[PDB]
């Protein structure tokens, strides 16, 4: 037979932070793996796609 009823209130503003995107890197395979070498660039073609 007991109830508690609030007689006043507080307006609280609470921050929420969410990730939405991330840095759009691109790493070119041939320039990463070989870089200017034609010898390496030809060996890397044997590994296909």
């Amino acid at each position: 037979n007991s109830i508690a009823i609030p007689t006043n209130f507080t307006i609280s503003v609470t921050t929420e932070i969410l990730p939405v995107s991330m840095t759009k890197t691109s790493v070119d395979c041939t320039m990463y793996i070989c870089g200017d070498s034609t010898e390496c660039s030809n060996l890397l073609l044997q590994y296909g796609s």
Binding site: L43, Q46, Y47, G48, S49
Partner: protein, 48 residues
């Protein structure tokens, strides 16, 4: 995206990966087992 993943997986069978031929039957027609196993391990590793 599924069709492009399967097409890429199938086109990789044609790659050498460092073996003398990308065809398993070429290695086994051309080479005897002691040297053939060296060419086949390159294809196994690349295909795996």
């Amino acid at each position: 995206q599924n069709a492009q993943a399967l097409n890429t997986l199938v086109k990789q069978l044609s790659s050498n990966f460092g073996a003398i031929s990308s065809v398993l039957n070429d290695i086994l027609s051309r080479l005897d087992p002691p040297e053939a196993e060296v060419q086949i391990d390159r294809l196994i590793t690349g295909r795996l």
